[PDB]
């Protein structure tokens, strides 16, 4: 029972940290996309 | 027992998520700095 309770708490911390990491990965992706667009446009203009 | 094995597997997933998220956050900050700096280079070039 107590083992299952700590399992639940660690699972909650795990899903929270996983969502934070996935959101950071999405922000990393978005940084890459705007990098691509701006670099293409300014360098293409050049 | 099996529940202790699940405790351990959750612990590995937890530490992996911690390192993953920390590295992703620092990478996002570094990537933003790189974007801004090269933009300043490219706008100046134009």
């Amino acid at each position: 029972p107590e083992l299952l309770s700590v399992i639940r708490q660690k699972e909650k911390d795990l899903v929270l940290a996983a969502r934070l990491g996935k959101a950071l990965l999405e922000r990393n992706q978005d940084m890459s996309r705007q990098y691509e667009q701006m670099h293409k446009e300014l360098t293409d203009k050049l | 027992p099996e529940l202790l094995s699940v405790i351990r597997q959750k612990e590995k997933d937890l530490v992996l998520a911690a390192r993953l998220g920390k590295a992703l956050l620092e990478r996002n900050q570094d990537m933003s700095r790189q974007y801004e700096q090269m933009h300043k280079e490219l706008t100046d070039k134009l």
């Binding site: 795990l14 996983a18 990491g21 996935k22 990965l25 990393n28 992706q29 | 997933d13 992996l16 998520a17 993953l20 992703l24």
Partner: peptide, 14 residues
Amino acid sequence: EGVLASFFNSLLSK
């Protein structure tokens, strides 16, 4: 971001 996505997929499956 391959290892990142692999871990996230594995955790979503769990």
